[PDB]
Design a protein around this ligand. Sequence first.
Ligand SMILES: [K+]
Ligand SMILES: [K+]
Ligand SMILES: [Mg+2]
Ligand SMILES: [Mg+2]
Ligand SMILES: [Mg+2]
Ligand SMILES: [Mg+2]
Ligand SMILES: [Mg+2]
Ligand SMILES: [Mg+2]
Ligand SMILES: [Mg+2]
Ligand SMILES: [Mg+2]
Ligand SMILES: [Mg+2]
Ligand SMILES: [Mg+2]
Ligand SMILES: [Mg+2]
Ligand SMILES: [Mg+2]
Ligand SMILES: [Mg+2]
Ligand SMILES: [Mg+2]
Lengths: 80, 310, 78
Amino acid sequence: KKKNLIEVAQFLPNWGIGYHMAKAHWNGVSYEITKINLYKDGRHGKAWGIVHKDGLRAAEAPKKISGVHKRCWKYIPNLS
Amino acid sequence: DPTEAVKELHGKILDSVNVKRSMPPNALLWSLIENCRKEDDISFLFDALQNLRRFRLSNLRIHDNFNCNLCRQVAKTCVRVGAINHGKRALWKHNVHGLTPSVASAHHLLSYALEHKNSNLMDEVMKLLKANDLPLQPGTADLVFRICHETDSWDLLAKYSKKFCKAGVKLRKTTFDVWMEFAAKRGDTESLWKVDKLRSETYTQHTLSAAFSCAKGFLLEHKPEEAAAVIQIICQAYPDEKKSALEAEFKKLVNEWPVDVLKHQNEEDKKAVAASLKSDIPAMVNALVNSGLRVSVDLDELNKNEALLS
Amino acid sequence: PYAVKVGIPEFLSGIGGGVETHVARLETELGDLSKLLVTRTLKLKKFGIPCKHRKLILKYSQKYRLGLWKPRADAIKA
RNA sequence: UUCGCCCGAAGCAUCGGACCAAUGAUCACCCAGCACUUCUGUGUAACACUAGUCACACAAAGACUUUUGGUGGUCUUAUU
RNA sequence: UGAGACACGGCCCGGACUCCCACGGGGGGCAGCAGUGGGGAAUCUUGGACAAUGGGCGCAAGCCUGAUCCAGCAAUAUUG
RNA sequence: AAAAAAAAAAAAAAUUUUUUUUUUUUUAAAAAAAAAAAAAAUUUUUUUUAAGAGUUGAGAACAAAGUGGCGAACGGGUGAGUAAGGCGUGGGAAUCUGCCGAACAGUUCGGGCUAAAUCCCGAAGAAAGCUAGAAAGCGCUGUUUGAUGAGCCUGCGUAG
Ligand SMILES: [K+]
Ligand SMILES: [K+]
Ligand SMILES: [Mg+2]
Ligand SMILES: [Mg+2]
Ligand SMILES: [Mg+2]
Ligand SMILES: [Mg+2]
Ligand SMILES: [Mg+2]
Ligand SMILES: [Mg+2]
Ligand SMILES: [Mg+2]
Ligand SMILES: [Mg+2]
Ligand SMILES: [Mg+2]
Ligand SMILES: [Mg+2]
Ligand SMILES: [Mg+2]
Ligand SMILES: [Mg+2]
Ligand SMILES: [Mg+2]
Ligand SMILES: [Mg+2]
């Protein structure tokens, strides 16, 4: 079964804050995690991030990430 | 299967976390660490760590991993009982237990590997160090050279000495002594003078065991004059504190050194080295007694060794 | 993911819904897929194709000629 | 069809206790976290001959702070 | 409940009638389109398609639509 | 178990060879999970279990059952009641109005339903998010408006 953003961030040190998360079909965009609002079960929650366009930061203040519980998320090992 | 301190401690935690929804005291986690006794009870400890990490983020809003000493102690407890797989899981960079890999956890794993004579456990612990991006340190080099002394692994010596020298670490005196004495055990003369040159680049003045190994390398060339001068200048520059230790090392010459240096040769080279040592080491003892050194040796142990009749 | 070489049977099997029973008749009487893409309802009615199957064939012919739909290549092993 | 009595299903409404079950506010108390102090234990690096000396994290305690989570009280029961 | 109902094919209650029930109890409302008994001198098919027009939902693709459109029965009507 | 392009000619044939980009690893330039059985000098061939798992990489349906939104207040039927709270016609003030058109402002943070939400609760000021697959496109909220409907009232006219 595929993993959402929370189920990927469980196998990450410091809960994935500081890492670049992206959906699997995305091509050249990721979010740099700033806050994770974990729920009770440990598999669902919210997320806040910094958007990066082509590896370059495009926004100043973080924003809440849409589609966190969609089972298509991954972390980029190269950008982070 | 579980020890009862541990089943009770695990529960009191998984009950605070899950039923009361409040953080337990740290003492309960630390006593679950201190009271682990058998291999099966540290799966209970890892379940506790996962549940406490989930609670720390979920209720306390703590993203951070478990701190350094806690990771040191969970690794040393995982290896004190003797579960090495979950012991080496503390070196993983990506884990659901909040464990930060450190040099100290690898030092515990390599201390076990030294104390239990485990040669491949070097290879897994060092591949875990490289995989999980931890830096290479002089104490790691100390432990690695000490274990590959005791396991008859020259390939590990060459590979990891190249890795450590490329990494730019500063090797201590003791690991240099271990390297020179093991190359004396094996008989690589060119490597012996190579590491002597490298340590002369590193430090200036010789110590006991390395001038000792230099004398071993010169005696392998059947040139007892330079060896005698080297141990002369290392004996003059000491007080009389280690008079029993130098006699113990001369007993090491007359007991254990020829066996170790002729296990790794061929049979005609065994005959040649047996004859060469039988010609040189009585002259070496007579030279040392002539130069003024009062050293108690057993020359009968030359013929009492079962290796030296090859 | 779509069929590279598309004929009448690939087209009708990509439509689905039981319309692939008329593959042999449409191969016999129309032959070419490009003739089928401009066939209209009276010709299909003369060939013995019912009302819903006719409407499906005409719908997917219009979709195919505009690029809006292609038959999938996964229907290759029967 | 209308009027006077008796009964009063469901339901809207109005009360009343009730801290019923939540929610909110406000008190304490308990862990835990951030900064702090240590003659404490356990590690890493110099050095020193094996002892010092820094740097860590101690959660290992401390104690006013302040926060996240709980628990136990109150609200002329404050909103359901 | 809802923007909108005190809501034909929603809910609650009471009543008459009716169908199951394993017998404890449940269920129903053609004055929607067809159709059947009955009453009457007397009044039709248990049809086809969503192609058109109109409507609901959907970004669309579409999906629903007995609205409708169109066939069937009847000298019932019509300057044929 | 990566993206793009080409493969038609001499001495039983679906999937391979070549060229350019790209992620990572191995020994500063190049090269490219565990177990069983076999072969070779660590690799390859076949098979079992993988995968609450140092991110398993794409894909297809999920209708399979639901939560939620919008619509089931329209359309369709009948004329039982109703003699004026109805209807016809003309007016009015003390109101609301989904969808639709046009401006402006926002769309922040916690908790609950075994799991989640555009569902429910709380705080500010009211809210709700989805989509780099629908990323400046939808949606929601507040305030001004147009449009359309609805509620309320009333003059006159309307059986025996
Ligand atoms: K239609
Ligand atoms: K007649
Ligand atoms: Mg009552
Ligand atoms: Mg509605
Ligand atoms: Mg209402
Ligand atoms: Mg009905
Ligand atoms: Mg009827
Ligand atoms: Mg009759
Ligand atoms: Mg239409
Ligand atoms: Mg629309
Ligand atoms: Mg019809
Ligand atoms: Mg006529
Ligand atoms: Mg209805
Ligand atoms: Mg109606
Ligand atoms: Mg009609
Ligand atoms: Mg009428």
